[PDB]
Write a protein that binds this DNA or RNA. Structure first.
Lengths: 161, 366, 260, 180, 170
DNA sequence: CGCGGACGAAGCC
DNA sequence: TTATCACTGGCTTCGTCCGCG
RNA sequence: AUGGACCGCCAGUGAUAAGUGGAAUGCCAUGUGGGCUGUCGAGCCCCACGCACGUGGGG
């Protein structure tokens, strides 16, 4: 379900950001009245509402240099490949895995936007449905993110035998 | 001709009826253990409410001799003559010399071997029959092995007298099979819809006057309990009930009061400590003409859990009722009454606003 | 021409028939004891609904009247298999006490302590009826119609009467499968020679298991057997059992029609 | 007297605690290890019955039954078990009270809260509204002449089904006990 | 199967414990808590990669943490029932009381075993009772499929080994 | 007054 | 801590007594 | 058509009454996120005008 509308947002929005600057600048200011300029693009496809609006905006606030796996596997592969700090991205993962629905959207933007910095691949659709899964199973999604991270880090280290 | 009633009723930390060690009775049903309330206990609760409400009281007792002796003592007999006369009452019946008696216990009249289930005025009538033969009993008490003097036919005719509870639930008396009456009500063992593990509560009893030994080291026994949404089912074979009571109007009053009692009563098991008194969340009366059909298989697959079972249980009984009406076509008059309004529950027939309205409509429909 | 029926009827906590002691009858099969309701008990119940509904096809369909002297036809051309549980079942003891109503200046010394055994499970029931002998003996083919149709519906509807007032074990079979076979009768009993594991229920799992066994036996012996089955679940398909029917009497009608 | 359970699901919260040794030891300070004691919080539902005819049979007099019942109800609201309180001061008055005088039978409202409340927002209002809805539904399903009545701290709702509202707990108790 | 990964956890952990103070304290804070709970996430960093139904993962996390929350006095194929009976006969623990606790665990569910289990096992390891953690792990894994079976094995092993230990003291 | 049904007499300690 | 712990039957032939018609 | 065929173990039943798990408890002492950096000719069609360089209207 949800993932279907999420894919509509990823293609449609993925085109408007890379294509039209005024919309890109009007949605990125909302990563509240200050984000109403964004509804005009994202509102018709929408706890899930908070998820969609936030992920579209954050997805849209990336630098141009940055313009089914989860987020944990993307982080572990970013550590192993791009050589980011491992132990520090480690505590930030452990801090997000405890937040509530409102905390994920306030702790999330730094790691995801910085992760996309230095061109790390991030499947936004899974991330969207994940932010939607905080309304019903926050702890479950958190556990999946962390587990995926460590498991894929271990397998990526062991396959480098 | 078969009024059958289904009901879903939750009980919180109830432990209404215990095995010998205090654990709630459990069925390993569908592969999963599910606490259950025995049918005989709830059947007793229903019969006590029905008898209390309709005014006629039945007595299931093994110590009839003592009671008849008390009534005859209130009739002006001496205590010893009352005892001998009541012994004659129970001795003058049965194939052999008499009804088997338990070893006499010092200071009290012997208890009968088998339990008797007869109305109270019938006990008074036995006292009267033993009273009009006062001289024969007085003469026979002197004999070493007194024999029964009272007429056997008259006593057997009094023991055949039926209460509403006997007409409804039946009785059995092995030594006088002519008096045995077949029950008109089938009462299923109420089990939980979902699997329930027995939760252990560790309780202690405080000694009020302070002592050093009294506290610190001392520990006090642990007591078991359980909670859950019980599924309940019961049948009333109307033709047999009409044959037992004889009149159809008395059968109607008996059935209506029985169903209402069936909803109203609760077994009272450690209720002074748990207060589990609760009304059923859903009731589904059906007037089946071919055969009564319980919906227990609907819950043979245990519910998974994590979320409130009442709504999922009601939807499951609804869905299963629909499928049975498709698979087994019938003209049975269905009907239900529920507290939740989140669903229409189309298969359970016409909805009635209240339990008494439902009962009255259904019983009037039969 | 033999028409046989397989049913997977479940029964809640009950003691429909019992041994000389209180415990229910049990057949140790597949290494796991499993409760059973003996064939004669269920058959006698069937005899009472069939004869009650019919208002001498009963001495023909079933062997011989219990209270009549042998009339040179003691056999019946009907073969009831003993119903047995799909899974292993531990006999579940129910401790009960009869209450003394009159009370002395002592408390609760109840009238009668005891414990009676009960059990619950999904019985796999099975029976076959030899149409050919029934036609040769009854004569009229229409008498055969009412006998087999009415016997089949009776086979589904009835449940033995034993300790039922204390336990309401009335129920409808979850699965019925009537296979008009011309070669020979076959019971799918060995499908459950390995008792199914528990904790999630058995109706669905037993349904699919019987489907696997039917698939395989039909593979070893492809036949012209006319088949059909009816269930109380619409969620799972059982292609090996034949065409699906909306209801039990519809199925019985189609198979009695199929026989002639 | 029913077992008071939480309306919502509550996970036990382990509370790590230590005891400081007052006379300084250099190694002990760095090690600093002690056991963890577990607590919990939540909105409890509470229920109780008083079978008046039996209480009159026990005391004998009806007047002593009145003083016993009224004083009992007031005690029922006022007291708190005091288990581990010098460490956590949990003295609290019930947010809502609903006395009913049932003549046919006592009816507990525990099924109203078998579906645990989801959360993230304050449970008090949702619990009160749910007890209201269930009380309404039971008077609909089970018609009766039982004299109902309630007293509540929140003013966000009128709670029509809980009968006539009384301004204070002692007023409610006095009215109901005098009403029986 | 499962027992293979379980043995990796027993050497690793048991080796990563007495050889680590920060990891030992970070995994012990999650005894008797769901793996879903945030408070045990500090433990995943050590145990998460070996998790081979869902019941399992809960099993490994459980034991691992509980195994790690023992006092140092306890730090440095039989089941748990035989370990308990031998602990009763040898160390002289209460027999009748450990008896009711065994009878209460044998009824629990997958979530109940992990909440009733820590007191007896951690207290059993108190006063240095030998406990084969690998068998215990696979046992906690066996609750997802055959809870009653594993419970019966635990109790039977306890009584049988208690009886044989009493009879061999002839 | 006739017919039908039910219980008893041992053998057995 | 204490009290409670069922009955009934699946033998033989005939005769007599009793209930009924 | 099998030491077989026909074939009910079955009628009844409160497990009851009673009960604090209680008293006490700092996870404390220590820490840069640091260095690098201007956002500056394809755009698809119709029409009008034009000095065919382009201008303008509409999508």
């Amino acid at each position: 379900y949800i993932l279907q509308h999420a894919d509509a947002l990823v293609k449609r929005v993925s085109k408007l950001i890379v294509n039209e600057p005024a919309a890109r600048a009007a949605l990125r200011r909302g990563v509240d009245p200050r984000m109403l300029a964004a509804h005009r693009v994202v509102a018709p496809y929408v706890a899930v509402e908070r998820a969609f609006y936030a992920v579209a905006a954050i997805m849209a606030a990336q630098p141009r240099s940055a313009r089914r796996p989860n987020l944990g596997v993307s982080l572990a592969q970013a550590v192993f490949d791009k050589g980011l700090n491992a132990d520090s991205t480690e505590q930030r993962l452990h801090l997000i895995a405890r937040q509530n629905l409102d905390g994920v959207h306030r702790h999330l933007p730094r790691l995801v936007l910085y992760l996309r910095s230095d061109q790390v691949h991030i499947d936004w659709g899974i991330l969207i449905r994940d932010l939607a899964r905080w309304g019903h199973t926050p702890r479950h999604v958190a556990r999946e993110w962390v587990q995926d991270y460590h498991r894929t880090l271990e397998t990526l280290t062991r396959q480098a035998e | 001709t078969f009024v059958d009633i289904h009901a879903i009723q939750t009980l919180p930390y109830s432990n209404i009826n215990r095995d010998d060690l205090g654990s709630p009775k459990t069925v390993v049903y569908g592969g999963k253990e599910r606490t259950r309330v025995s049918s005989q206990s709830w059947k007793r609760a229903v019969r006590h409410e029905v008898e209390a409400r309709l005014g006629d009281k039945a007595v299931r007792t093994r110590r009839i001799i003592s009671e008849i002796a008390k009534r005859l003592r209130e009739r002006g007999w001496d205590a010893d003559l009352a005892d001998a006369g009541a012994r004659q009452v129970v001795l003058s019946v049965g194939k052999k010399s008499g009804i088997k008696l338990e070893k006499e216990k010092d200071s009290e009249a012997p208890a009968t071997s088998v339990l008797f289930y007869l109305p109270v005025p019938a006990i008074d009538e036995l006292a009267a029959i033993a009273d009009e033969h006062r001289d024969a009993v007085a003469k026979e008490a002197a004999k070493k092995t007194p024999k029964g003097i009272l007429p056997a036919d008259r006593i057997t005719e009094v023991l055949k007298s039926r209460n509403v509870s006997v007409n409804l639930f039946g009785r059995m008396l092995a030594e006088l099979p002519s008096t045995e009456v077949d029950g008109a009500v089938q009462f299923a063992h109420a089990f939980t819809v979902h699997g329930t593990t027995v939760e252990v509560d560790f309780f202690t009893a405080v000694d009020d006057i302070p002592k050093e030994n009294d506290h610190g080291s001392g520990h006090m026994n642990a007591g078991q309990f359980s909670a859950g949404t019980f599924y309940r089912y019961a049948n009333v074979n109307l033709d047999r009930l009409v044959e037992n009571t004889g009149d159809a109007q008395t059968a109607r009053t008996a059935v209506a009061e029985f169903l209402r009692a069936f909803l109203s009563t609760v077994p009272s098991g450690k209720q002074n400590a748990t207060a589990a008194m609760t009304l059923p969340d859903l009731v589904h009366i059906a007037v089946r003409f071919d055969r009564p059909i319980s919906f227990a298989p609907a819950f043979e697959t245990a519910l998974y859990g994590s979320d409130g079972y009442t709504l999922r249980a009601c939807q499951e009984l609804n869905n299963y009722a629909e499928r049975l009406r498709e698979v087994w076509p019938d003209d049975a008059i269905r009907g239900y009454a529920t507290v939740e309004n989140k669903t229409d529950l189309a298969a359970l027939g016409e909805r009635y606003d209240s339990y008494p309205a439902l009962i009255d409509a259904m019983v009037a429909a039969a």
